Design a protein around this ligand. Structure first.
Ligand SMILES: [Cl-]
Lengths: 202, 205
C-alpha cells in the first residue's frame, strides 16, 4: 500500500494552503475536513445515523445537516459533540481508506486536524508533517473566515494538543506564520523531493 | 430511502442469530450482517488491511493480501491488548460500512446483525429496536463447539467478553427464544415481528 504522510496542525494553521501546494506537485490529497463536509451534505453518508441520534430538527429540508443548529448544540454539550463524532469519525476513516485505495499519485497525504492526538492516525501514517503557527495567528485566521466567537475558536483550541506537544511529535515541520506563498513553496518543494524518495524506498 | 427503520438483531455466540436473520430476509427484510462486513474489510484490498499491516506487520497479511486469520486468532485469544488493537481498527470500519450497505438496501426496513450490540452505546442509539435471540448458555456452548470447532475455553472467553444473558434480555425490545425451537416454530415468531416491523417502518416514514 501507498506511502502516506499525515499533514496536521491546529485550527487556523493554514493546513489547506500547504496541502494545496503538495497537490499541485503531484501528491494525492485526502482531506478529512472535506469528507466530513461531504458526508453531512445532501444525501451524505452520515445523514441517516445523524437523524437517528439527533432527530429531524438537525436535518434541513434539502436532506443535509443543519450546521448552525448542530454547531450550537455540540459547543454547548460535550455528550452531543461526542455522539456526533462517534458517527462521523468512522465514516471519515472509511472514506479516507477508499480514496487512498484509488489514489494515483506517487504518495498520499491525509490532512487530519487531530492527528497527534490519535493513536490510530499516527500508526496509520508513514510520517507526520506539522504545519505550525502561533496561537494568536491561528485565532486571527479562523476569525477572518467563518467568524466563530473567539469563544468557539478558543474552545476548539483547548481540545487540541499543545503547540509544543504537536511539534515534538512531528517528523517534518513547516512554520506558516507570516510566510509568503513563495516561501511556503520553497519548503514544500524540498519535502516533496524527500517524500518521493521515501515512497520509492517503501 | 428516507427515515430508514432499523432493527438491531443480536444474541450471544451460538444463539442462532443467523437462523432468525435468514427467516426475516426470506420475508423481505434487508439484512446487513456485520460479520460479513468484517470479512469483506479484511479481504484482499479490504479497507482494514493497511492499518492492520501498519499495526501488526506483514506476517498477518496472507499471500493474496488478506488477513491471516489463523495467525491473528492465535494472537488475540492469547493477548487482550492485541484484541483491543485489532478491534480499534475493524470496529469503526464495520460501523461505517454498515451505513453504506444500509443506504443501498431495497427492503421496507433493515436488520443489522450485531454480536456486540447491547454492549455498545453506538449500536443502541443507531437502532430503532433491539431484537435478542436468546437461549441457555449450555445450548450456546454445545452449538458453538459442535459446529464452528471452537475449543470450550475460546467459547467461554467469548461468553465472558459478551454481556450476560440477563443483561441482554433486559435491554431487549423484542425477544425470540431459540433453544429447542423447530424452524417452523421460529417462523411463527418471525412472521409476527415482521408484520409489527412493517407497521413501525410505515409510521416512521
Ligand atoms: Cl473493504
Amino acid at each position: 500500500h501507498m506511502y502516506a504522510i499525515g499533514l496536521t496542525g491546529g485550527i487556523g494553521s493554514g493546513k489547506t494552503t500547504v496541502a494545496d501546494l503538495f497537490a499541485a506537485r503531484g501528491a494525492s490529497l485526502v482531506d478529512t475536513d472535506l469528507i466530513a463536509h461531504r458526508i453531512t451534505a445532501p444525501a451524505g453518508l452520515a445523514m441517516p445515523a445523524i437523524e437517528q441520534t439527533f432527530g429531524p430538527a438537525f436535518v434541513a429540508a434539502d436532506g443535509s445537516l443543519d450546521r448552525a443548529r448542530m454547531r450550537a448544540l455540540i459547543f454547548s454539550d460535550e455528550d452531543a459533540r461526542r455522539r456526533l463524532e462517534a458517527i462521523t469519525h468512522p465514516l471519515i476513516r472509511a472514506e479516507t481508506e477508499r480514496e487512498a485505495r484509488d489514489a494515483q499519485g506517487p504518495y498520499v497525504i491525509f490532512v487530519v486536524p487531530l492527528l497527534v492526538e490519535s493513536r490510530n492516525w499516527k500508526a496509520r501514517c508513514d510520517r507526520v508533517l506539522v504545519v505550525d503557527c502561533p496561537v494568536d495567528t491561528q485565532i486571527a485566521r479562523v476569525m477572518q473566515r467563518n467568524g466563530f466567537t473567539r469563544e468557539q475558536v478558543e474552545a476548539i483550541i483547548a481540545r487540541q494538543a499543545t503547540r509544543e506537544a504537536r511539534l515534538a511529535a512531528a517528523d517534518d515541520v513547516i512554520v506558516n506564520d507570516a510566510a509568503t506563498p513563495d516561501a511556503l513553496a520553497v519548503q514544500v518543494d524540498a519535502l516533496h523531493q524527500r517524500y518521493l524518495a521515501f515512497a520509492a524506498a517503501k
